[PDB]
Amino acid sequence: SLLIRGATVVTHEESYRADVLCANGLIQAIGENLETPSGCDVLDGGGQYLMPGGIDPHTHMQLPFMGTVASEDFFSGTAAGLAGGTTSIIDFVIPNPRQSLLEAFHTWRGWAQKSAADYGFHVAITWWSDEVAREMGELVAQHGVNSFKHFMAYKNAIMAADDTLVASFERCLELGAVPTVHAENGELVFHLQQKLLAQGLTGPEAHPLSRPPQVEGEAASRAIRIAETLGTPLYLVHISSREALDEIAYARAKGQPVYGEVLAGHLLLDDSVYRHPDWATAAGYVMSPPFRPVEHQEALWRGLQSGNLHTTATDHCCFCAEQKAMGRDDFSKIPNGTAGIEDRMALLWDAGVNSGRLSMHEFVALTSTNTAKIFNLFPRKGAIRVGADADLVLWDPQGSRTLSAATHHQRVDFNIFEGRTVRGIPSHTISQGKLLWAAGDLRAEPGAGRYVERPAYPSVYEVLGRRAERQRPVAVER
Amino acid sequence: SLLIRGATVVTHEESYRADVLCANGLIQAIGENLETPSGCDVLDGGGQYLMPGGIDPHTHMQLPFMGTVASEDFFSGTAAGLAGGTTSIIDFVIPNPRQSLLEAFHTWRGWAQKSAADYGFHVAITWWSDEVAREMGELVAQHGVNSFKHFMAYKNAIMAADDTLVASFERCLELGAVPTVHAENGELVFHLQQKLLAQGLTGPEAHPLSRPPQVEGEAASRAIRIAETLGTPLYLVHISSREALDEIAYARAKGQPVYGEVLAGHLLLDDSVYRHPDWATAAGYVMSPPFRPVEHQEALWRGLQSGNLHTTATDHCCFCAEQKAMGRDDFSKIPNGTAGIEDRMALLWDAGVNSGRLSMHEFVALTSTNTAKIFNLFPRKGAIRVGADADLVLWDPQGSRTLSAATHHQRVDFNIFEGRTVRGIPSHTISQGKLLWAAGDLRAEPGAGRYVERPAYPSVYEVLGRRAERQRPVAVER
Amino acid sequence: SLLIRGATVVTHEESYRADVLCANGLIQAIGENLETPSGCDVLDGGGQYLMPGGIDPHTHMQLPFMGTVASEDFFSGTAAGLAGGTTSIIDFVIPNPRQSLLEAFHTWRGWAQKSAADYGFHVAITWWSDEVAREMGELVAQHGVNSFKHFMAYKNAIMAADDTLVASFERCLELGAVPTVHAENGELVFHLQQKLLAQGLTGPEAHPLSRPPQVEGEAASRAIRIAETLGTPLYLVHISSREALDEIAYARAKGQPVYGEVLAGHLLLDDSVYRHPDWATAAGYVMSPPFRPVEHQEALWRGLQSGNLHTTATDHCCFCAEQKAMGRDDFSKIPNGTAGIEDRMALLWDAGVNSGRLSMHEFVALTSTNTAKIFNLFPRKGAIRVGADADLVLWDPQGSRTLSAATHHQRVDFNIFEGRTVRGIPSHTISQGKLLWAAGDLRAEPGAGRYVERPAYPSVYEVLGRRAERQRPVAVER
Amino acid sequence: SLLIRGATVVTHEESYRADVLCANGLIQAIGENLETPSGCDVLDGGGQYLMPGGIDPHTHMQLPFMGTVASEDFFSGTAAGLAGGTTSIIDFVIPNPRQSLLEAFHTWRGWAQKSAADYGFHVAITWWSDEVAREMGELVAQHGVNSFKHFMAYKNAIMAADDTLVASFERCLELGAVPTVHAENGELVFHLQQKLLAQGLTGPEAHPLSRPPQVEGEAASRAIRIAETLGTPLYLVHISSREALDEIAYARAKGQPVYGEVLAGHLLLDDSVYRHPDWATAAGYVMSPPFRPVEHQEALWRGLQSGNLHTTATDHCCFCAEQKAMGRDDFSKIPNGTAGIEDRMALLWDAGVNSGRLSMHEFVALTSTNTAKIFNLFPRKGAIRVGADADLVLWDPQGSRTLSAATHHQRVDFNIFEGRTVRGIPSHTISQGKLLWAAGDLRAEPGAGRYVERPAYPSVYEVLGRRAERQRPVAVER
Ligand SMILES: [Zn+2]
Ligand SMILES: [Zn+2]
Ligand SMILES: [Zn+2]
Ligand SMILES: [Zn+2]
Ligand SMILES: [Zn+2]
Ligand SMILES: [Zn+2]
Ligand SMILES: [Zn+2]
Ligand SMILES: [Zn+2]
């Protein structure tokens, strides 16, 4: 039991002064001057904002990938998220091609058991068969999964060509699941990788050039039009480019339910990082899609302000220096990914709220609420109201923090925002009504987190069903 | 006290089964299986949706205009809104040029005392001076006004040119008031009127021709760029054209807070109505901006679906055949306006929700919540939650109604949708906790409604303030 | 706008020939041979007195009371007032014991929405608690209330005992509010009722005997000495007895601000009405305090001439024959109250001015100006001057009226001055600058009236503050 | 022309912030921020109260009386008033017995010529005849007299017995004039003087004992009951006693128009002053009626608070020590009279307003407005309104003054309030639009004052006529 007193509550749509009482993992009461019940502890939020805790819908804790295993595991990752105000995640079960989805699912459940805060899974469709379709049904009905990931890159690995995307998206529709997509054209990437390697361009500066922005635009257009065609919603992960974002706006402008995710890295970093002359420094930044020329960062902010990008995530996929160095003589073999779970909320607040680019309300929407609506977890999560999960962050608008690999809780030796100072930080993080992060002190305990099931058929399927019924074809009499 | 039992509650975000208890003007409790307190009636809403009652932010009850007085008054018009599910209105105080705003405000407050449902005012800036600027402050500080209308058409009457728009918008920023605008280029309208009359085209068929869609798009661009330049939000009334909508989309794509209102008539009728062979019929459709060719309807529906249009309203401004007939020999003298307060919600439900263009949540957002947020009345209005005003509509998705001047409650002899049959209707309407419409029985009572005051500084001005500091000029030294 | 021409202006202090221009709710100009602005209507007031319209600070429109509801509602009652030259009222919010003051105020505000002329509210303190005290402060700071009513009668219902009277009067002093009192000793009344009923004396003739004059004198004494002890002003409603009037005179002769109100009915009728041979007719007169032996009348006229009574009112509280008949076998169950709003001015004029007891100036003082000063509405009301509200009555000293239920506009089947003919009548009544009564034609409109907010700390509080300083207790050292 | 800027206007009934513009002897405008018209001087009234100038309706400038002539003359007396905030006086024409009234009038007009501020006369009826009766008519019709003084004391000089009172009062009624009376029983005074002196009690301490309070109460009773009987108003000068005040209260409580004037001396001093061991000090206080035992002072304050005393004045009748000393061996030969014209307003303000005994509005009523109303000069005087005479005083509540014969401007060697310190004083005094007292400086000019006519029939005669219509006695037939 925990009563937060004196703060201003801030939701995705309003702000008001009120105390919030938590017990048994839930919000119990919200109102002015509530009394403390005996047993309960008190937290003074005077001068602070109390917001729904962050949901990071894009994590890869201890992912085996590109020859190795991410250096952050489910506990260290989730604990670091907590230190940064993030209170739940959604990670990805990634079966190898031809591996049973269910078997990969149970393996991933075993790995995620050590989570310190709430977690769930998307499941990736890395090959296709009747078995796959059947196992998707089983995951939805029995394992609380309602979203499936598709990768349009990684040729001769896990790439889904059209036949798969069509068949899988069709199945998603049958199941009321949300297809999500990593959108980059895998043929062009493969092709550009070979050509650049053949020219002797082997360093990280080659990485951006192996996948310039139109490669992402193309795949997005494609995913979106497959989606339009089969009558499914669509969530595109890590949008980095104007081209991809413009495809998103074009589709929403026709009334299509398409949602975009953006990472802080793509909002704040440009592709000059990859030309850095220290190898390890430049490789620190190697992720897909890569950081982009500067005109792209402002397009993405505009996307957030105009309602064409809807959520923020980190794609938290950590590799240490020695692991990155696997691609020392071949950039295509640098394990791809950057850390960011701890730093998402602060970076977005600092660059977005302080600048007056975003409101506090949009900050909540973009850090928790939209993700929760999209994946059918609202108002269980991403909401301050009676009966909702007690996942909250007490935000100190004038608190200072300098981001650094020497000081972060992320178990990785590199921070893409090394040396950056932000104003506005999580002074306290509450998960399941417990205080897990309190002014410098992290109290994450392995296994405290719960697996979060997400029901099928978010509400967008209502609307889609009325549309499909309205446009059912009818034969000419004769 | 009134208990609405057995319905599905539908808000701007979600749908869930619960009972809602109203008393003393407010929603007191929401939940399943609520007990009936002693002395409270019960309403059975099984198989029905219970939604916030509609807010129509654009009405002109008993307006004196174009040489006469609108045939619907504040009583009959609010009563008619109630019969159609609309529970509050915002109307316009329109001073003559050189007439004191406070004086016209007090005349309109006198006329509105007969309202049967909650009501409020925007106040129009029809001329400029220091005194006008002073009176604006007093209206905001003392009389619950937080928005000011400007007309960009009506040359040689109430048109505001650039010098007034600039001075007034600047005053709005200082006061935390939202500037709203009627966007048509008045010089062009004037020119084309003169020219059509010179050509010998004096009939109603000449009206759309006198104000083609680019005249709206120009003026929209202008007011929008003025707003951008001075750092204010902007609300555009009765957007009817692709051109204006495209200007709004363009502005919003750059992060600018621009809002757009649309009428059901502009969503559903085209300009063929002006060619009707019966003079009075043609004249009945005469309003500004006029009905447009079909491509514009489609573009406006997509606007609603993409979030570039935000509110619905009616521009409820009623004149009977004998009043319209004042322009018998000169289309420019036909009093401009049509009726719609009663029909807005069902028109929109029937066209948007049954077709699957809009979800029920977006219907709620477009008919109340968004208006409420924009004008700083949320969650007092547009919300089903404890403490909120008990303004509600119970909606029968299988009910039917044919729109007709023979049977509508609007005190006017013409309906622009004569003969249209809708499916999905308001079975019951509740205002201030009272059952004012019940399945064919209208129980509106003169005077019952309250003047609704709207606090200044909706949250958008906070964001703008931070934005302004960030982008302030900095002198060169040295 | 309204030009009243050729009348003699009669105020609380002077009479002079002048024309009076009304526009925008207010008196715009006063002067000899004013010019008629175009659009303005002219009212010919030749040979008439133009006085401030009547204020009746004691009404109970549609009161639920003694197991029923008054037959006059806020529209019918205020329309009737207007026809009788009365242009505004103060009515009473009467919470049930243990009911929130705010909740009652809100209910009453909704019932008064239908009022046709300006109206206000006193709020009754019918029980006591910290929350009552808080609510009193809120009514005063936000809801325009500056007077609180207490009942010393009605044992075992809403009686305020001495602990409540002290606690409330002290709270009124804190808030700059005026305490008002219904002064009868509830315990004596309770006791005499039981006694008379046990003797089998069940008819209306018992009603006066159940509450003889000394019961009023005692309560008045008590409320006055409480007020004196705590340092507050005091207003005593409906003074009917020599004894209570002598208590007011005694207090005032020691420099205490005590005000007294009187009804025309206690000026003009005596207790023989209760021995009427027709049950229903005797019952028609039952109100509290009841009508008195005849020497009380003459004492009250003298109160008015000496400045020991200050206001006139009606305690307008209407019950039809059927409702009175609820006490057919038990006088204590006959609903208490009589009608008067329409008749007060003419009755006072005819008995007071025509006989020469009172000057015309005293008549204005007693009918509007004093009430206005006492409750902090002077000179907004009860004054003829530029800028005051245009609430005016045009009084024809040669006119004549026979009072009758058959023709009065009060919605009740009984008039306590049935068959009385008066000389000097209101020919026209103007409220908010509109002509609402005119030579026999009532043109009152539902809802037209406005809620009139009354500020705290009328000027008697400055004097009491300096008194209190001079009387401060000085300690002796240790 | 004089603009008085930034003061708070204080009247007999309200206060409000406004400037006041005077020109041509008159108030021209009253409003917030008035422009200084050219030619006009400006007076900074910031932080001060602007009030109608005092009217002293009881002065005896250079009166021949008790074998000598009053040491103050019309110029020095009116000058002194100005310095004390008094702007107009009413003095007395006192003809000798058998002397023509017109004759004494013209002499007194010659005397009053030198006045520095506005002045008028009452005329004393010191004997009776058909000629006296005729001349009274002439004085009212041609010389702007509307009030006649009667002396009930001074046996064997100017005393009017009952037959003169009756005939003069009846004649006042025929002419529309107001009877005023010095009420002491002359026979009892004469007897007591004789008896005190035969006892050898020749000192000033015998002076009070020669005319104890009941001698005043008796004459007041008698004057009142004459007025009542003949149907006239009545103004009683210098009331000093409980007894007389109680007769006033009793008469007013029968609805009779009787007014009471009081002097600061009788509010503030007691009879112990006549016992001072120094002869000439004790003789300084000798006037009629004498100062009284302390209980009379609190009773008079209460008469003022209760509305049984109506005006303040001074009976300004100055004699120096050597003239007083004429009664060194015989108190009955001490010329009677004290000074106070200069001190009235400050004494009343300090003792009445600072104490919280009176409001500031009451202070204005008591120092000018009621006198004005009573003698038919309202609103020419005693009023702050457009068209009134610009007689005004600017009051500095924080100013201080110590009253001394050594420093006052009154041309007399004695001050009955020597050494008394007052808080609240007139800083500036304006008469006929001109600043005559300012910052400690007097600028009075001999002859500047005008003679002020008072028209007959003040409105009290309207009420009285209504009564006399109703007293038609009717013969018996059945
Ligand atoms: Zn990816
Ligand atoms: Zn990823
Ligand atoms: Zn418009
Ligand atoms: Zn409009
Ligand atoms: Zn009562
Ligand atoms: Zn009452
Ligand atoms: Zn005298
Ligand atoms: Zn005298």
Author numbering:
A (entry chain B), B (entry chain A), C (entry chain C), D (entry chain D): 2 to 479
How is this structure described in the published paper?
Dihydropyrimidinase catalyzes the reversible cyclization of dihydrouracil to N-carbamoyl-β-alanine in the second step of the pyrimidine degradation pathway. Dihydropyrimidinase, hydantoinase, imidase, allantoinase, and dihydroorotase belong to the cyclic amidohydrolase family because of their functional and structural similarities. Most of the active sites of dihydropyrimidinases, hydantoinases, allantoinases, and dihydroorotases contain four histidines, one aspartate, and one carboxylated lysine residue, which are required for metal binding and catalytic activity. The global architecture of the dihydropyrimidinase monomer consists of two domains, namely, a large domain with a classic (β/α)8-barrel structure core embedding the catalytic dimetal center and a small β-sandwich domain.
To confirm this result and determine how this enzyme can also form a tetramer, we also determined the crystal structure of P. aeruginosa PAO1 dihydropyrimidinase at 2.17 Å resolution at acidic environment. Crystals of P. aeruginosa dihydropyrimidinase were grown at room temperature by hanging drop vapor diffusion in 10% PEG 8000, 100 mM HEPES, 200 mM calcium acetate, pH 5.9. The crystals of P. aeruginosa dihydropyrimidinase grown under this condition belonged to space group C2221 with cell dimensions of a = 108.9, b = 155.7, and c = 235.6 Å. An asymmetric unit of the crystal contained four crystallographically independent P. aeruginosa dihydropyrimidinase monomers, in which two zinc ions were found in the active site per monomer. Thus, P. aeruginosa dihydropyrimidinase did exist as a mixture of dimers and tetramers at pH 5.9. In the crystal of P. aeruginosa dihydropyrimidinase, the four molecules formed two pairs of dimers, B-A and C-D, respectively. We noted that in the crystal, another crystallographically related tetramer B-A-C′-D′ was formed and further stabilized via many hydrogen bonds and salt bridges. For the tetramer formation of P. aeruginosa dihydropyrimidinase, many hydrogen bonds with close distance were found: these bonds (<3 Å) include K374(A)–E14(B), H13(A)–E14(B), R386(A)–E14(B), R386(A)–E15(B), R467(A)–V354(B), R468(A)–G357(B), E14(A)–H13(B), E15(A)–R386(B), V354(A)–R467(B), G357(A)–R468(B), H13(C′)–E14(D′), R386(C′)–E15(D′), R468(C′)–G357(D′), E14(C′)–H13(D′), E14(C′)–K374(D′), E15(C′)–R386(D′), and G357(C′)–R468(D′); however, these residues were not found for the tetramer formation of Thermus sp. dihydropyrimidinase. Comparison by superimposition indicated that many Arg residues (R253, R358, R386, R467, and R468) found in P. aeruginosa dihydropyrimidinase, but not in Thermus sp. dihydropyrimidinase, may play a crucial role for the pH-dependent oligomerization. On the basis of these results, we concluded that P. aeruginosa dihydropyrimidinase could form a tetramer, but its oligomerization mechanism differed from those of other dihydropyrimidinases such as Thermus sp. dihydropyrimidinase.
